[PDB]
Design a protein around this ligand. Structure first.
Ligand SMILES: *[C@@H]1O[C@H](CO[C@@H]2O[C@@H](C)[C@@H](O)[C@@H](O)[C@@H]2O)[C@@H](O[C@@H]2O[C@H](CO)[C@@H](O[C@@H]3O[C@H](CO[C@H]4O[C@H](CO)[C@@H](O)[C@H](O)[C@@H]4O[C@@H]4O[C@H](CO)[C@@H](O)[C@H](O)[C@H]4NC(C)=O)[C@@H](O)[C@H](O[C@H]4O[C@H](CO)[C@@H](O)[C@H](O)[C@@H]4O)[C@@H]3O)[C@H](O)[C@H]2NC(C)=O)[C@H](O)[C@H]1NC(C)=O
Ligand SMILES: *[C@@H]1O[C@H](CO[C@@H]2O[C@@H](C)[C@@H](O)[C@@H](O)[C@@H]2O)[C@@H](O[C@@H]2O[C@H](CO)[C@@H](O[C@@H]3O[C@H](CO[C@H]4O[C@H](CO)[C@@H](O)[C@H](O)[C@@H]4O[C@@H]4O[C@H](CO)[C@@H](O)[C@H](O)[C@H]4NC(C)=O)[C@@H](O)[C@H](O[C@H]4O[C@H](CO)[C@@H](O)[C@H](O)[C@@H]4O)[C@@H]3O)[C@H](O)[C@H]2NC(C)=O)[C@H](O)[C@H]1NC(C)=O
Ligand SMILES: [Zn+2]
Ligand SMILES: [Zn+2]
Ligand SMILES: [Zn+2]
Ligand SMILES: [Zn+2]
Ligand SMILES: [Zn+2]
Ligand SMILES: [Zn+2]
Lengths: 206, 206
């Protein structure tokens, strides 16, 4: 019969109050004989009624796919509230229930350190600026680079790695030509994480 | 019917001539009515006959599982030879063929840099020694730490990350208490990779 998938908000949407985090409940393999789909949403077991369900959409494999979106409150998600999607369909023996929440566990604030290019690499035409983020929990995190208000997008970040103390770490490598680095330009590593003050911090390098 | 899975050698076994890399051809879901399994092995399409097939082994879901192991030559694997496992069974319409080789692509030698703890972290009771390995291809790689001939095992390494030039990088973080680091002890980052001389290099820190 039908199958339900429940997806969390985009991590960056949970960390910036300016943005609207949403949870998305997707039902696939809805038949033509049983096309009616009913969604019920609960927040910590309390039924809520402000969800937005889109009209069914027929797929190329002859099934219907229907989606329901519930906006979530910034503080609710961060405070660990649980979001239950309940899907009812005539072709089902009983309704399907899916629950989702923010990654659970005691939060731990990242420590952010920047490291300049080593001497050996300062013989190359391009040098690595490194941002070390360690000791954070949970693993949800965003890292960007900037200089003079404008973003520096020639960077790559490792996934979070589980450390031996149960927290996470990662590294972010921004590559700039010596041209800008030897002029003394300030480059900034920006880190977003729930456990930071305002979920934000930045460390500069020069 | 039956299914075949073909697994490569352990990466570290391919980089040390002392060791014996092996490719392993696993056949699952062999029935009781058709228990006979025949393996044929080819190296670049040439049939070879030195493989070691283990006796069938009945599983808890009422099927047989049978495994064939072919030793591979250090230089053959590194030189991109292709290993074909061919499985024949009466319950099959036609034999199943699986081919495997070393990750393909032009090799690129890693650059290894070590970075000492930043000043900010030197206020903590434990400091991070960092080993940056960048510019390597393919992504198969091994990284360890040592000091005075003995291994330093309190470390974590990020997975390889695909860089913007199509090569890979990673970082390895060894955590030691200031006790050993302030005594001036030499810690060594050891990197194994096909494209290094003897597939090995090391960079020390102090
Ligand atoms: C009939 O067709 C249905 C529609 O599929 C589309 O229609 C045609 C055109 C086909 O060509 C399809 O290829 C095409 O995609 C099928 O629906 C799919 O069903 C499967 C299960 O049978 C679902 O698989 C599950 O996918 C989860 C991830 O889904 C995200 O990622 C997909 C890309 O990787 C993407 O297509 C999805 O839309 C969704 O993408 C995210 O959506 C959210 C919310 O909208 C966004 O917030 C994100 O930004 C999106 N991110 C990305 C990267 O797009 C998996 O998580 C899940 O793995 C789970 O199940 C596995 C086992 O399967 C477990 O092991 C695991 O632990 C976990 O529980 C799972 O694979 C798929 O999502 C459905 N696709 C869509 C679009 O809804 C029908 O299956 C098909 N039926 C038949 C009989 O043919
Ligand atoms: C009947 O039972 C068979 C035996 O399974 C065991 O028996 C009983 C006790 C059950 O309780 C089982 O849980 C138990 O495991 C089943 O065989 C299994 O079939 C599935 C497919 O149906 C196979 O899945 C495939 O697994 C690949 C990885 O396999 C490695 O990792 C497994 C753990 O993750 C491990 O169990 C395997 O032994 C193997 O482990 C490696 O072995 C090599 C060589 O020996 C070593 O060199 C490594 O060091 C080992 N590494 C590790 C970590 O152990 C996957 O790669 C593969 O994903 C592939 O297929 C998927 C789709 O499924 C693709 O999407 C993907 O792209 C890729 O192609 C796949 O999942 C599984 O390996 C089989 N298990 C064994 C032990 O052989 C039967 O399936 C089952 N049948 C029925 C009808 O019940
Ligand atoms: Zn229809
Ligand atoms: Zn719950
Ligand atoms: Zn907040
Ligand atoms: Zn039997
Ligand atoms: Zn081939
Ligand atoms: Zn060699």
């Amino acid at each position: 019969g039908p199958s339900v998938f429940l997806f969390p908000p985009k991590p960056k949407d949970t960390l910036m109050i300016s943005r609207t985090p949403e949870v998305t409940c997707v039902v696939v393999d809805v038949s033509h004989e049983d096309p009616e789909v009913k969604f019920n949403w609960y927040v910590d077991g309390v039924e809520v009624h402000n969800a937005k369900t889109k009209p069914r959409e027929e797929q190329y494999n002859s099934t219907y796919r229907v989606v329901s979106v519930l906006t979530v409150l910034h503080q609710d998600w961060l405070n660990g509230k649980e979001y239950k999607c309940k899907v009812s369909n005539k072709a089902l023996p009983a309704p399907i229930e899916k629950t989702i929440s923010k990654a659970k566990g005691q939060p731990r604030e990242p420590q952010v350190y920047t490291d300049p290019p080593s001497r050996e690499e300062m013989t190359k035409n391009q040098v690595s600026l490194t941002c070390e983020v360690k000791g954070f929990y949970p693993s949800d995190i965003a890292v960007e680079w900037e200089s003079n208000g404008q973003p520096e997008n020639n960077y790559k970040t490792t996934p979070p790695v589980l450390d031996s103390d149960g927290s996470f770490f990662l590294y972010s490598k921004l590559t700039v030509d010596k041209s800008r680095w030897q002029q003394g330009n300030v480059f900034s590593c920006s880190v977003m994480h729930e456990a930071l003050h305002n979920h934000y911090t930045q460390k500069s390098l020069s």
